[PDB]
Design a protein around this ligand. Sequence first.
Ligand SMILES: [K+]
Ligand SMILES: [K+]
Ligand SMILES: [K+]
Ligand SMILES: [K+]
Ligand SMILES: [K+]
Ligand SMILES: [K+]
Ligand SMILES: [K+]
Ligand SMILES: [K+]
Ligand SMILES: [Mg+2]
Ligand SMILES: [Mg+2]
Ligand SMILES: [Mg+2]
Ligand SMILES: [Mg+2]
Ligand SMILES: [Mg+2]
Ligand SMILES: [Mg+2]
Ligand SMILES: [Mg+2]
Ligand SMILES: [Mg+2]
Ligand SMILES: [Mg+2]
Ligand SMILES: [Mg+2]
Ligand SMILES: [Zn+2]
Lengths: 141, 55, 194, 61, 136, 102, 74, 43, 142
Amino acid sequence: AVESVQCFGRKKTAVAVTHCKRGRGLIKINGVPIELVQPEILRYKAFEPILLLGRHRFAGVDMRIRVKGGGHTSQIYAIRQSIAKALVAFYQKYVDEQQKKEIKDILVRYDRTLLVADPRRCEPKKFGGRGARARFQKSYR
Amino acid sequence: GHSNIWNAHPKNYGPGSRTCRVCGNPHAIIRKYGLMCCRQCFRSNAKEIGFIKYR
Amino acid sequence: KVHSDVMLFNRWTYDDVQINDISVEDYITATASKHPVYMPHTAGRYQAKRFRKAQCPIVERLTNSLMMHGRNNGKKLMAVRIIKHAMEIIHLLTDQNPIQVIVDAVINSGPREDATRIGSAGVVRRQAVDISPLRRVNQAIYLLTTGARESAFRNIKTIAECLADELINAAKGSSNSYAIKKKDEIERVAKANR
Amino acid sequence: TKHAIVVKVMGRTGSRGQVTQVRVKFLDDQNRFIMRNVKGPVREGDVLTLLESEREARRLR
Amino acid sequence: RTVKDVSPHEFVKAYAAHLKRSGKMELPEWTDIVKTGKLKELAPYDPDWYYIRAASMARKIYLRGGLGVGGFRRIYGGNQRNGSRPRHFCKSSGSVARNILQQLQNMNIVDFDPKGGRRITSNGQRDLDQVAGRIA
Amino acid sequence: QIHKIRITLSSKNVKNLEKVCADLVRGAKDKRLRVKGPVRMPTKVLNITTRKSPCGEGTNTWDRFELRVHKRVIDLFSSADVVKQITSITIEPGVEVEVTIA
Amino acid sequence: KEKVNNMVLFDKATYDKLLSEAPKYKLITPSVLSDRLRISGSLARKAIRDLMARGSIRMVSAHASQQIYTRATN
Amino acid sequence: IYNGKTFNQIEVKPEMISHYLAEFSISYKPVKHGRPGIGATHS
Amino acid sequence: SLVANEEFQHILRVQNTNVDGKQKIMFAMTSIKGIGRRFANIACKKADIDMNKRAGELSAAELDSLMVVVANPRQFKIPDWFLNRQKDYKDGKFSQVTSNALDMKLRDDLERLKKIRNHRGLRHYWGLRVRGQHTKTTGRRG
RNA sequence: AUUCCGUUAACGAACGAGACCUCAGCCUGCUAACUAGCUAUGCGGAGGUAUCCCUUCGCGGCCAGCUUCUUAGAGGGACUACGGCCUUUUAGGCCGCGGAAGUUUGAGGCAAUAACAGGUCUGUGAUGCCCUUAGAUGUUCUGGGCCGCACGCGCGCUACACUGAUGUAUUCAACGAGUUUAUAGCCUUGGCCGACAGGCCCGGGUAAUCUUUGAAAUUUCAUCGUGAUGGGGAUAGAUCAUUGCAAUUGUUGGUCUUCAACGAGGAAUUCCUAGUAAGCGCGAGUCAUCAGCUCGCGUUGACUACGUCCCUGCCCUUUGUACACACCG
Ligand SMILES: [K+]
Ligand SMILES: [K+]
Ligand SMILES: [K+]
Ligand SMILES: [K+]
Ligand SMILES: [K+]
Ligand SMILES: [K+]
Ligand SMILES: [K+]
Ligand SMILES: [K+]
Ligand SMILES: [Mg+2]
Ligand SMILES: [Mg+2]
Ligand SMILES: [Mg+2]
Ligand SMILES: [Mg+2]
Ligand SMILES: [Mg+2]
Ligand SMILES: [Mg+2]
Ligand SMILES: [Mg+2]
Ligand SMILES: [Mg+2]
Ligand SMILES: [Mg+2]
Ligand SMILES: [Mg+2]
Ligand SMILES: [Zn+2]
């Protein structure tokens, strides 16, 4: 029986799904190593789940991540959230609950968005203005 | 008038080639989905047509 | 001392960084114990409640205040890059921790007193009032970024270089900084309108 | 230039409520309380740097 | 080591250099006079722009094997300035894409996909993989 | 004598469409037939936004009119006669039923 | 105001001044060289490349919109 | 050439080939401005 | 190569037009009326001039080569569609007019339009817009 | 919140508010997916030690499994539930853990009594009266005009630059819309021709089946170097295509050339409190051809405040009135 889990991260319209299973500890997104993710500035956000838990805890799981929708920042945030959730679920289901709780606490203490999706969404625009709140310029004379 | 002259101007396109199917006015025609109704007539008959206001 | 493995940009350490102003200590987040972050990009909700933005890292607040004027609105990756380059230049020029330099610049740039408009009916009357620490930090950040932006405009000097020079000249009250001069002018007006 | 800590907030002051009146207790002298007008958000436990402590705050309105 | 494991920029440079060294490409006479699209204001700065574009197109075909001339026109398009009017998306030159595809086919790097467009050949896969491996 | 019979159901009322789909599924099951679906396609939302005023005066206010079309797909593995018999059941107004092969 | 008369090509005095003092600057950027040696940005970039080739300076960090260089030895 | 009101008179010259007859029969009278009336300013 | 040579020229003359020696050749040539960035780029490419050099760095022979390239686009395989005088009214030839020749051609066009009482010519004579723009609100200078 | 607790010559009620309904936010829980996907397997290509093993791609399995990802039906979920303070043992309020969510969760739709001589007779085969009704104010055809330019004003688009322009490389959306098949009409893939604009030929889609493998700002590396400059793109010349019966008073779209004001804008004045402002692009309406407009959509994403009645206004109470066409009295 295959030992794998599939957890998804969300940010705006971006949806990333991480396939975590027993392996030698490779992390790739769309077949590309996680070290080459773009933009280069957001590599820190991408690697945050790994820099807090260290590379060793990922040494026994192969992670394959597929992302879709959203934009360049939303996709990165969704990817990191999916990685965190997938690792937590894998530790919960195939590793001692004590270690799963430890890693979950470590992840949450740094940033709660690593496991809980941000619910913010675009506000629909209303007639009488260009934006959701912004109204057309008013003139009196 | 003479057959070759009376109503001889082509009417294959433009506002003059279309009219409201309800009132025959040529202005503010809604051509979406084939309604072919003027905005006033469409707003009058929307409930019968099956268009509902949700927001 | 508190040791944190988190390093800003994986290059700078929050250890040995201490805020030396009791008035504004609680409204600056630049210490290893106050939730250090790897990058000043955190996509958090800090406007939900009053005083919540005080928990945002000071570097992130500087980055946000670097996105002013319409042409730059929403361009946060460019601002983060500018902050990174300014921090590198600060470390090169001063040999100190850039985070400490930023903290000192913020501390020294914040005005302490101001003159508030009073009366009404077309009367120009002012009275000196105190400034809260949070408003002091906000004014410091705004003045620093405004000085950097005005220096960079219509000048071959890059924005990062101007920001680094402003931060260096504000960490010490050199009076060559735009923020220091603005704060001195504000306090002079407040004293005049006592 | 002294330091005082806010003990309580009396409320908004001024025509537009721009400033908030607070009671601040000097840190150097714990038995001296003074009245100050503060600009910007302020809550209990805050510390202000008083460039001069002689004046007494009065309602701007 | 394959192309997916190397930076796209470095691989593009290396493969453009390899294509130029190959000598099998037949640049059209107009390469030095035409822009890369109606949306451009000037011709490409780099004299080797044709080889770089060919390398990028070959990499794109390697990643996806159903692209046509219109797809490449969209891929290399972008905003078009209209003076005092707002900008809108604009397609790039189609003749350049067609010529590059024909030249790449002549070298056995790509062929015609039965479903339409172009597909990477086994020889193309081998060549791109070797170029990526030699980048290190 | 077995074929994949395709049934497409379209309606503006969700309740009637769902009830018809359930009735068809139960009828197919009662005959020991293999049923795949019903598959719910993304809802089609026809939208028309027209100005409220019949003239040009006043604040420009707009009416958002939507017409929602719900489509369902059901696949049955059986002969034409049995599916024809099953589809003969009473169908409420507003539901369009189309039966085809493949 | 008075327009800056930056030179697009080095003269011998300015080139010697570059080779003498530039390796002793804590921070070296095209803008810094342009302001100090009174040279254009393009000439400043070329001079930075030349100095890097000579090994007298090192690259702290390289970016398209910002190049940071410093003396090779203290 | 009719301009909507009258048939304007012209003679065809060699330099006018490849042009429209409308280009030589102006349909409007060129504007010569009188003094502004009531309501021109104070807007 | 970073040091200016003794032959560096700060100012040079081409068709009675002052060309800045400090500017790059491609954009220095644009100071001549009738020559733009595109045409200057192609002319430099056809004349084998190195685009990385300044206007003053090069030699006079290279300026002569540039001028012959400009004056004979067809000889150097420059297409007809790339020229600012295509299918001339009188001669019917394709060429790149520059300097006072361009002004002569513009004057000839305007006077030809005005002579026949063409509507565009009359609009040019009256000092009004000729391309159909509205004139009620914009273009107010006198 | 005329929302409630209460006080009470009032007691019981009826509208508005709320409830309601639509969209969005959570569900690894239910049903079901060859017009949506994932997983493993079988085969094949490429790379790596080249068999076996690892990495990455392509193709089939309606008897490989499944529904995390997508779709849409049923339901669950938040009630301030719980803890600490304040408040009349009330109605309630502030903070806080947990939680997808603790401003009525966010945004909308709907929306009372009584009114305006507010707009519409140019939406209507809605309509009273008046005018005209054959040399017509009816209708149709040709042509012109509605766009005309000393000037004033309103909503806007493009900018004044290096937080940038240009040239490469790089790669992430959502709401939607699409045919009479006639050789073919709408959305158009693919191939060929062409520098572009465009043209020709095979075809798909009446549609989660095809366009749709579907943006820009941005990211990345070079050139430019403070110069109205490679900023800016007004004006104008030549010439080439497409739509249309017809393009002149340029319909629109390409090529080369020309290169104006503008160096951040006085008195004044608009919008806006979070995925909001602003920037960036996209779809639809109008549409033979034309979007700087409107209606929606998404991407990047902030500063400041979370207070007041000073200005401009609104609600309630008290009070004055010589007003009631109601202080523009
Ligand atoms: K600058
Ligand atoms: K005018
Ligand atoms: K009437
Ligand atoms: K109408
Ligand atoms: K008020
Ligand atoms: K009230
Ligand atoms: K009185
Ligand atoms: K009264
Ligand atoms: Mg010129
Ligand atoms: Mg699911
Ligand atoms: Mg009236
Ligand atoms: Mg009009
Ligand atoms: Mg408007
Ligand atoms: Mg995409
Ligand atoms: Mg210019
Ligand atoms: Mg330009
Ligand atoms: Mg028109
Ligand atoms: Mg309009
Ligand atoms: Zn009608």
